[PDB]
Design goal:
The complex is a heteropentamer, with two copies of chain A, two copies of chain B (432 residues) and one copy of chain C (127 residues).
Chain A: E1 3-9, H1 10-27, H2 42-45, E2 51-53, E3 59-61, E4 63-67, H3 71-78, E5 90-92, H4 101-105, H5 108-125, E6 130-138, H6 143-158, E7 163-170, H7 181-195, E8 198-203, H8 204-214, H9 222-236, H10 238-241, H11 250-257, E9 265-271, H12 282-287, E10 306-315, H13 319-332, E11 345-350, E12 359-367, H14 371-385, H15 392-395, H16 402-423
Parallel strand pairs in A: 1-4, 1-6, 4-5, 6-7, 7-8, 8-9, 10-11
Antiparallel strand pairs in A: 2-3, 9-12, 10-12
Chain B: E1 4-9, H1 10-28, E2 46-48, E3 54-56, E4 58-62, H2 66-73, E5 85-87, H3 96-102, H4 108-120, E6 127-133, H5 137-154, E7 158-165, H6 176-188, E8 193-198, H7 199-208, H8 217-236, H9 245-252, E9 262-266, H10 281-287, E10 305-314, H11 318-329, E11 344-349, E12 366-374, H12 378-393, H13 399-402, H14 408-428
Parallel strand pairs in B: 1-4, 1-6, 4-5, 6-7, 7-8, 10-11
Antiparallel strand pairs in B: 2-3, 9-12, 10-12
Chain C: E1 4-11, E2 14-22, H1 31-124
Antiparallel strand pairs in C: 1-2
Bound molecules: guanosine-5'-triphosphate (4 copies) and magnesium ion (MG) (4 copies).
PDB class: cell cycle
Keywords: microtubule, cell cycle
Assembly: pentameric
Chain lengths: 428, 432, 127, 427, 432
């Protein structure tokens, strides 16, 4: 369990993926040219989990950049760490997906899917011990959602024994691009329930709310949203790229976090909440685990019960203090953890804080409260589906109305399942 | 890559094409001889010859040669190859039956042959942009025939229209409501999206905002060209946020027949004044919901929005756009249907709206073009349908169509179809 | 004081003894078994992986069925548009020709009558 | 839709036809020899609609001059602009038609009809894009009425897809005392109802009244009546001869003006009303649209309802003022326009005024009030037909009494039809 | 000769082996390169000798992943071991027993047995095996149980003694550790002769309390574990008199095959940084033996009954003082033994003094003691583990991870039923 192959698909997937690569490069002391200029051995100990070592001292991200349109690829190449990427790993079509899941999954996406598999196969065969795949994408558009989910199932066919992990950006009317977002998201959730092992739910509703309410940004932009996403992704991957005992690899994390196969949707949390232009004690950080204000999915952790939680503390802090505060947070809030999964909160402490901060906390939660996010998508979906609004754009691509009823049913079943375990008692 | 073929039909279609292609040349730095001394997105609308000259991906068609002859002898006579400027000898005499059957059938194959030759030069054809009036014999009849033949030769390939809605102030014929209903009926099934432009709205904006006493087609077409250029700027440039032919269709058309967006444009400032100062992003965004800035006369307060697409251009920042749209979301006077959770597609291009030197429009720092699907546009169909009924009840002028081989049943079928469309706008505006 | 000390062993680096405080109140597998169990588990692991691939193959077949459905629908739309237009162009041709044949029949009859008037004028004249 | 072939038949047709050719030649800057000596480009832009370009820079009217008697043809040749015409295009017989429609339509006219078709075929085949035919003739005589209507049906047979337009001079007892004029006119109206696309009704009753009452000419001559006709014809063909958007060709005009096939009889109007030896404002000109005094057909426009109207303003005037005044004239007079034909009044403005004037107005009206002109002819006809007076003039030529009953019925039906749509409501 | 082969399985087994072998080297005067500048020859039971005069541990270090063993391969003692005895795979068991037993373990098991066979070939009087492993890890649980099964086939009547790490939440790595513990105990019960359990919480708390270490690391825990393992094996590696052979462990501590889990107690555990304190007497260290604070497994011996007690004294200890110390303890405490066993202790004195790693957390003491007692009170550790198993298993939480590796649900029922029978056995044995 060493190498991870990263895939970023569509406008959203490429934007948050480029931001991920720039934060972790800074943390690992890697410059825009792939050169290491750090001052710690912890920075290079697990560098191979995400980077390949190329000709003469340089490190190249094991990343495949995908889109059905070239514009997004160009903006990444031009961006801050654009030249760090392997040029042969940029795979793009010319047609675009027209913000249509059916075009990404069945038509134009199917035409470009083989070109992507060939690049990810080259990266995977190069691995001494492949952990699996990490995909960043949006659920609201056409390429990230439709083609990204098509890629998951084609990779599932060739690598059925590897871990499939996603960072899935949930659409919100608060920061919306297209009218059909609830259809594209529902058709993607249906695919993620069946084919991924771990999905981090990155909700644009929660990110907009953090920027507006907490960071006091009257008019947040994608840059403000993506600054929170980059800090969150740096936090959730801490275990994978620095030496440590707990959840050090994709399979060990899945085994610790997923008690039931379909319930693999995580609610990420982060403290402190910062803006792009600029404190915090151990008890203050531990408290944010139950704070809906610090959640990256628009759900309240106090509304459900945590099945499992991974808490990651970063920076110079006392491990003894972290241990004391974590025990207190579980004992004081006993009613928000399922009683039938003993010691279900695992804590890890890393001496290297994220880029720009001196201390931080990141929470990977598998909470039954995530059903609120799925219910919100379901209600937006039924509002359109009841009237069959915009359906000709999907049926025109060869889809049947039946696939919509099936995607909706599966998602309502998933909500019903979270509710079933939220109510499940130890005394059967 | 991502090419678009422009088809200009009849006097209105050709004269509007004149304004558009002149403006695209100015916007991309192309000289009238096709030469240009890097974005490269303009290649969606211009092919290149071995000699480095840029040629529009366009066919200009009229059943009479007068209008196209002005292009053939004008400033841009070297920009187009003569094989793409097609004309017959006799016009359709403001008769749909002559455009579609009697006169159109004699030139239809030649037009398709030239479109086929333009399509051969496309590696990723998005579809077609068809410009035509609803009122003219060629604009109505020949376009309907061409739409039908394009569906046979290109199947479901995207077909979008720019249609001139008739207005009495500049109207040329009494039978224009007949020609409009017949062409709408035939075209409904073959068009994917039709952007309607009411001549009375363009006429009144020219009088009010530009201080032009008696606006001519020259004045109307300069303004129309500005709007068409705004709709195609996302295709011909690569800005902060883009939108292709497919993205317009997916966002603006919830049901196949409901494909008529309302166009709004701001700011329209007279080349005089100078003391106009510069309008903010919020100011130009607000103006799009004012009925005075609409391209079709109708009242959006009497209707409900199902989709709104904002096409910004010039000195525009996404932060400024989001703040402007946020204030618009809170407007009680701007009602959306309950089955539409989100109705905003934003697109931003950095190239300011260029104006024809010596023209009536001022050089603004930022401008916006809104495309909105409102059920209020059914008011334009109701106006047209009523005028049709008045004449058809007496079979007034019907003998002119029947004499060309048309049957009276076609008038009944066409009108019944538009009556169903009126009911469709009513049903779609209902709450669930 | 009642403690029975019993010497056990005494060696180079050790010494041992038993201390008694009170007496008591009351006076294979095979390689084949292992191999059978491990092979049974491997077959279950392989069976579930094989069923997964069979279902993923069913999703690939569905993908082809939707693409084929899209292509058939576009071709059927072309077929319907072609025969609707051919019917419309031919009906119109029949009608226009019928209208112009009826108007030339009227003119022809009027010219036959003119020679009939010419005939009567001739017999009125002369005689 | 480029070339128009002009035909003038009989004494009246040739007289008004020659006057048309001299007015439009002066307007287009063409002298009596066919030479252009104008100054404006608008004068030559559409010169080909009426003139052929011959050897050298000369322009020759595309006109065929027809008569069963030679006199009027000699008069035309001698007249002003007589030499402009193509000599081979003068087709004449020697017999005459004796003011008898039967002689023109069936006997003498039938003998000369082929010689005419020979000349019009040569003109029509020379056309790059033939619009159709324009005929000037009288309805009360023998040649213009009988032979002119025979020509219409023969030309129609060979050119069924072309526009057939006439300038038809309606007889009046005021001008012409030849007693059988109601018979010749009725037999011609019957033909025009069935075979023309547009007929301008030029009434001698109205022309006589304008000269006598308005122009104060105690004894008007054909020269005085024809001065009004020449100004009116210059006005109605303005759209065909000069660059413009509205009614630029014969078919576009017909499609805009004729809602029902039989109702193609126009009432022309003109302002200012001038003598042969003589400027109004825009509001003054627009008012004359409802003035019976300015109508060239002896009908009152206020007596009926306009189905369609084309208003042509000529001279240096504000298009904005013309637009304002034209809106006001239809809003104020809403009761005189049929409600079931929306926007039925189309206005055109031309910078070139007619010969001799600085500003003018011409109105092409399709009004239900034209039934008054047909009723007048019908009553005169029945007064004679009831007694079978002069019937042997027509039966002697081989005609049956049945053709008279049929012509009368057709005309009464036409009156009944104008009345039906005058009373037709939107309901 | 009485040779013993040590088998270190998984991260816990390998890291504890590091501490053990470092301490044995210090105790026998062996340098990290295997040299010893040479008491008695008993050290040969744990170290073979090469032709070059170097001493090599009779040990195999196994892990399904290479990270932990790689530290041994590159560390200070990389010359003490030959690379053929440090065996690693590439992919670990991902904290899943089924993965370590049925999937990954299956491919490396033969290689490990082959290397064990080669170490056994160098033995003249092989006593048996000492297996160090965690209950919680996928390798410590799954691979050890697979290895125990094959060792029973290849070495019929050879003794197998375990040193097993009982899971503790303070240092726990996985939620599913109670599943792995019950599954490995079930499969290993029949193949082990004696298992000395070590609760990570007990040693974690002794490090905090006795050594003043705020947040103890595995380095601190294993240094302490190493002292206890050294105390137990001292009579095999030195010419001792109690538990001088492996078979003697079953004879002295195991009355019934299934009840093979002795409770280990150790004293004194003194901080190295302690301000120069007076040495603890024999009475003082003996009394501490009977205090729950000094136990390796958290449980209450007051709630149970002893069936055997072995006192392993080390250093400056006289039999007269031991007997006086034991006499007082019986006088004051209860020391309830089961009715069929006599109340008494088997005492052993190993004159070799207690050795500590220089620079470590433990002070060098003049005398120390390690008690091994088979008490029914240890069933409290099984009850804790069994309850956590039941809570998760009732909902089938995490079970899909095991079934996906080829395991059947019936194995969970069988494993739990077997540990329910074990709980009943401790209850039956303690009855009278
Ligand atoms: N947080 C965040 N959300 C984004 C970003 N870009 C787009 N989104 C969201 O993602 C959804 C749209 O998905 P996209 O990935 O942009 O679509 P696409 O795959 O590029 O589709 P095409 O334009 O057809 O190629 C919407 O709900 C947006 O709010 C970004 O940079 N950050
Ligand atoms: N905005 C605008 N409208 C025009 C223009 N030219 C004509 N129209 C309108 O188009 C309608 C008349 O149709 P046309 O396009 O001129 O006719 P055509 O398509 O050439 O057909 P025919 O001449 O009958 O063969 C009326 O409503 C006019 O006001 C133009 O340049 N701009
Ligand atoms: N306005 C006008 N009416 C005329 C003129 N000449 C004759 N008329 C009228 O025409 C009618 C008589 O018809 P004519 O044209 O002279 O006769 P024709 O068509 O030549 O037939 P024939 O004399 O039989 O050869 C009467 O209604 C006259 O009032 C003229 O120059 N102007
Ligand atoms: N005392 C002690 N316990 C340890 C040590 N390392 C791990 N553990 C415990 O062992 C359990 C986890 O099992 P591991 O031995 O690390 O895992 P493994 O045997 O390598 O198996 P995989 O990594 O899953 O293949 C937890 O209870 C840990 O606290 C160590 O060095 N000392
Ligand atoms: Mg994109
Ligand atoms: Mg035209
Ligand atoms: Mg005469
Ligand atoms: Mg391990």
């Amino acid at each position: 369990m060493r190498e991870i192959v990263h895939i970023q698909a569509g406008q959203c997937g490429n934007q948050i993926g480029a931001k991920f690569w720039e934060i972790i490069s800074d943390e690992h002391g890697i410059d825009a040219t792939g050169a290491y200029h750090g001052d710690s051995d912890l920075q290079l100990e697990r560098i191979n989990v995400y980077y390949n070592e190329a000709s003469g001292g340089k490190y190249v991200p094991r990343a495949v950049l995908v889109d059905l349109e070239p514009g997004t690829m160009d903006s990444v190449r031009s961006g801050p760490f654009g030249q760090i990427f392997r040029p042969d790993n940029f795979v793009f079509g010319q047609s675009g997906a027209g913000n249509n899941w059916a075009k990404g999954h069945y038509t134009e996406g199917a035409e470009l899917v083989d070109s992507v598999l060939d690049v990810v196969r080259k990266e995977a065969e190069s691995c001494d011990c492949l952990q699996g795949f990490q995909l960043t994408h949006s659920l609201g558009g056409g390429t990230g959602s439709g083609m990204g989910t098509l890629l998951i199932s084609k990779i599932r066919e060739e690598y059925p024994d590897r871990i499939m992990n996603t960072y899935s950006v949930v659409p919100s009317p608060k920061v919306s691009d297209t009218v059909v977002e609830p259809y594209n998201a529902t058709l993607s959730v249906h695919q993620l329930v069946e084919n991924t092992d771990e999905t981090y739910c990155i909700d644009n509703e929660a990110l907009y709310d953090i920027c507006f309410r907490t960071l006091k940004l009257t008019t947040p932009t994608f840059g403000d949203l993506n600054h929170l996403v980059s800090l969150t992704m740096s936090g959730v991957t801490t275990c994978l790229r620095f030496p440590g005992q707990l959840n050090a690899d994709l399979r060990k994390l899945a085994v610790n976090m997923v008690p039931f196969p379909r319930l693999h949707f995580f609610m990420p949390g982060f403290a402190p909440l910062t803006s792009r232009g600029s404190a915090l004690t151990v008890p203050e950080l531990t408290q944010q685990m139950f704070d809906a204000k610090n959640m990256m999915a628009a759900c309240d952790p106090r509304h459900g019960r945590y099945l499992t939680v991974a808490a990651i503390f970063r920076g110079r802090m006392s491990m003894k203090e972290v241990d004391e505060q974590m025990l207190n947070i579980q004992n004081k809030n006993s009613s928000y953890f399922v009683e039938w999964i003993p010691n279900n909160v695992k804590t890890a402490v890393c001496d290297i804080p994220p880029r720009g901060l001196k201390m931080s906390a990141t929470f990977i939660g598998n909470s039954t409260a995530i059903q609120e996010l799925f219910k919100r998508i379901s209600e937006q979906f039924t509002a359109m589906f009841r009237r069959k609004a915009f359906l000709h754009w999907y049926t025109g691509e060869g889809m049947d109305e039946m696939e919509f009823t099936e995607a909706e049913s599966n998602m309502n079943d998933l909500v019903s399942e979270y509710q079933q375990y939220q109510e499940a008692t130890a005394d059967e | 890559m991502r090419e678009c073929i422009s088809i200009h039909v009849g006097q209105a279609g050709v004269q509007i094409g004149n304004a558009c292609w002149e403006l695209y040349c100015l916007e991309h730095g192309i000289q009238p001889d096709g030469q240009m001394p890097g974005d490269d997105s303009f290649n969606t609308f211009f092919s290149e010859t071995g000699a480095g000259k840029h040629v529009p991906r366009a066919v200009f068609v009229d059943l009479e040669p007068t209008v196209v002859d002005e292009v053939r002898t004008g400033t841009y006579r070297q920009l187009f190859h003569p094989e793409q400027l097609i004309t017959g000898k006799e016009d359709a005499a403001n008769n749909y039956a002559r455009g579609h059957y009697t006169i159109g059938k004699e030139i239809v194959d030649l037009v398709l042959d030239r479109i086929r030759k333009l399509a051969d030069q496309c590696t990723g054809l998005q579809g077609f942009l068809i410009f035509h009036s609803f009122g003219g014999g060629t604009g109505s009849g020949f376009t309907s025939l061409l739409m039908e033949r394009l569906s046979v030769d290109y199947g479901k390939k995207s077909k979008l229209e720019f249609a001139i809605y008739p207005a009495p102030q500049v109207s040329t014929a009494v039978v224009e409501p007949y020609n409009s209903i017949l062409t709408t009926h035939t075209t409904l099934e073959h068009s994917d999206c039709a952007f309607m432009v009411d001549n009375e709205a363009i006429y009144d904006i020219c009088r009010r905002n530009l201080d032009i006493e008696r606006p001519t087609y020259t004045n109307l077409n300069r303004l129309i060209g500005q709007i068409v250029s705004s709709i195609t700027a996302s295709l011909r440039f690569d800005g902060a946020l883009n939108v292709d032919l497919t993205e317009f269709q997916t966002n603006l058309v919830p049901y196949p027949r409901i494909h008529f967006p309302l166009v709004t444009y701001a700011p329209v400032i007279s080349a005089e004044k100078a003391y106009h100062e510069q309008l903010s992003v919020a100011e130009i965004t607000n103006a799009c919901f004012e009925p005075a800035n609409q391209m079709v006369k109708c009242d959006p307060r009497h209707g409900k929005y199902m989709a709104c697409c904002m096409l910004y251009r010039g000195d525009v920042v996404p932060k400024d756009v989001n703040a402007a749209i946020a204030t618009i979301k809170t407007k009680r006077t701007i009602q959306f249907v309950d089955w539409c959770p989100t109705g905003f597609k934003v697109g931003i291009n950095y190239q300011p709206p260029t104006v024809v030197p010596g023209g009536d429009l001022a050089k603004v720092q930022r401008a916006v073009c809104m495309l909105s699907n409102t059920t209020a546009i059914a008011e334009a169909w109701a106006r047209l349908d009523h005028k049709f009924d008045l004449m058809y009840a007496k079979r007034a002028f019907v003998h002119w169509y029947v004499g060309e081989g048309m049957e009276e049943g076609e008038f009944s079928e066409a009108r019944e179809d538009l009556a169903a469309l009126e009911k469709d706008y009513e049903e779609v505006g209902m709450d669930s | 004081a009642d403690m029975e000390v019993i010497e056990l062993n005494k060696a180079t680096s050790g010494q041992s003894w038993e201390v008694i405080l009170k007496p008591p109140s009351f006076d294979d597998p095979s390689l084949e078994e292992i191999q059978k169990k491990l092979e049974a588990a491997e077959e279950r692991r392989k069976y579930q992986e094989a069923e997964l691939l069979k279902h993923l193959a069913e999703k690939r077949e569905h993908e082809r069925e939707v693409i084929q459905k899209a292509i058939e629908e576009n071709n059927n739309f072309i077929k319907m548009a072609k025969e609707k237009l051919a019917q419309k162009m031919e009906s119109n041709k029949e009608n226009r020709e019928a209208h112009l044949a009826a108007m030339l029949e009227r003119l022809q009859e009027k010219d036959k009558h003119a020679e009939e008037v010419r005939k009567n004028k001739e017999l009125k004249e002369e005689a």
